[PDB]
Design a protein around this ligand. Structure first.
Ligand SMILES: COc1cc[nH]c1/C=C1\C(=O)Nc2ccc(F)c(C#C[C@@H](O)[C@@H](N)[C@@H](C)O)c21
Length: 273
């Protein structure tokens, strides 16, 4: 750990603080996650999870009551980019590219039974090359899947698809889709837009740990009202990413074959660093 010089604090990650740091021998600029404290075996496996759309775990340093994770560094997160793009909005071709690449990263994760669990614009990283990467995996509730909010203990890869749908919508409209500030408010914001789920659209839902028969019964809103000005292909894909039933929610693999991605390209973003 004495091999690393702090450049600056990036922020709080899931299990500790992330810093931009430099390796004193090589000169490598990295993102160093300091975890404060079988997990060692779990992380060892994460090091093998290599993909162009996953931030590279370079090294794991287990020294003391201390665990440091040395990751690849990227210059910007998607939230910052969205914020900087808020006057014009991110161009649709760039939205489409970012969505497509994230679905590739997730299809890869998911094929290895690895879930992200906490996808949000603040943990999606971009570079000048036009790439976007999944990071900070292996409180904001805005992106949480409804099965989690309803107390599912053993949730599935479908949770990441839900989160990515919310992010997709947000890139298009320049507004957070479901900006809740408590679990119930989050849940009720979802219910008010998509309709209160019942046994018809989500078999099993009334059986969930925190489902209450006494939940208000709201009607589904018209979907063309939710994400203007997204085209029919985009709205169709989004609706499949936001299905209530986790088992009917589209997989990352199937989403990549959606007609929305017929004309996908890889634009370069204009980043001010
Ligand atoms: C604000 O986040 C930025 C901006 C540039 N890079 C990052 C983050 C990481 C980077 O470059 N490599 C990484 C490897 C594992 C990582 F977990 C990260 C990360 C992250 C973030 O979720 C938190 N540090 C923030 C949101 O508070 C990063």
């Amino acid at each position: 750990m004495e091999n690393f010089q702090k450049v600056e604090k990036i922020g709080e990650g899931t299990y500790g603080v992330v810093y931009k740091a430099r390796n004193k021998l090589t000169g490598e600029v990295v993102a160093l996650k300091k975890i404060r404290l079988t997990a060692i075996r779990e992380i060892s496996l994460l090091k093998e999870l290599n993909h162009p759309n996953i931030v590279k775990l370079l090294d794991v340093i287990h020294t003391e009551n201390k665990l440091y994770l040395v990751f690849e560094f990227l210059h910007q997160d998607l939230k910052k980019f969205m914020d900087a793009s808020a006057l014009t909005g991110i161009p649709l071709p760039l939205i489409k590219s970012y969505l497509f690449q994230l679905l590739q990263g997730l299809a890869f994760c998911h094929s290895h039974r690895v879930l992200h669990r906490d996808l949000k614009p603040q943990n999606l990283l971009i570079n000048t090359e036009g790439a976007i990467k999944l990071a900070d995996f292996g409180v904001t509730l805005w992106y949480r899947a409804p099965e989690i909010l309803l107390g599912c203990k053993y949730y599935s890869t479908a949770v990441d698809i839900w989160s990515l749908g919310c992010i997709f919508a947000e890139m298009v409209t320049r507004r957070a889709l479901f900006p809740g500030d408590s679990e119930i408010d989050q849940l009720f914001r979802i219910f008010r837009t998509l309709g209160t789920p019942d046994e018809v659209v989500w078999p099993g839902v009334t059986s969930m740990p925190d489902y209450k028969p006494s939940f208000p019964k709201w009607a589904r809103q018209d979907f063309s009202k939710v994400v203007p000005p997204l085209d029919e292909d985009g709205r169709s894909l989004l609706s499949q990413m936001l299905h209530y039933d986790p088992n009917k929610r589209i997989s990352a693999k199937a989403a990549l074959a959606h007609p929305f991605f017929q004309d996908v390209t890889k634009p370069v973003p204009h980043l001010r660093l």
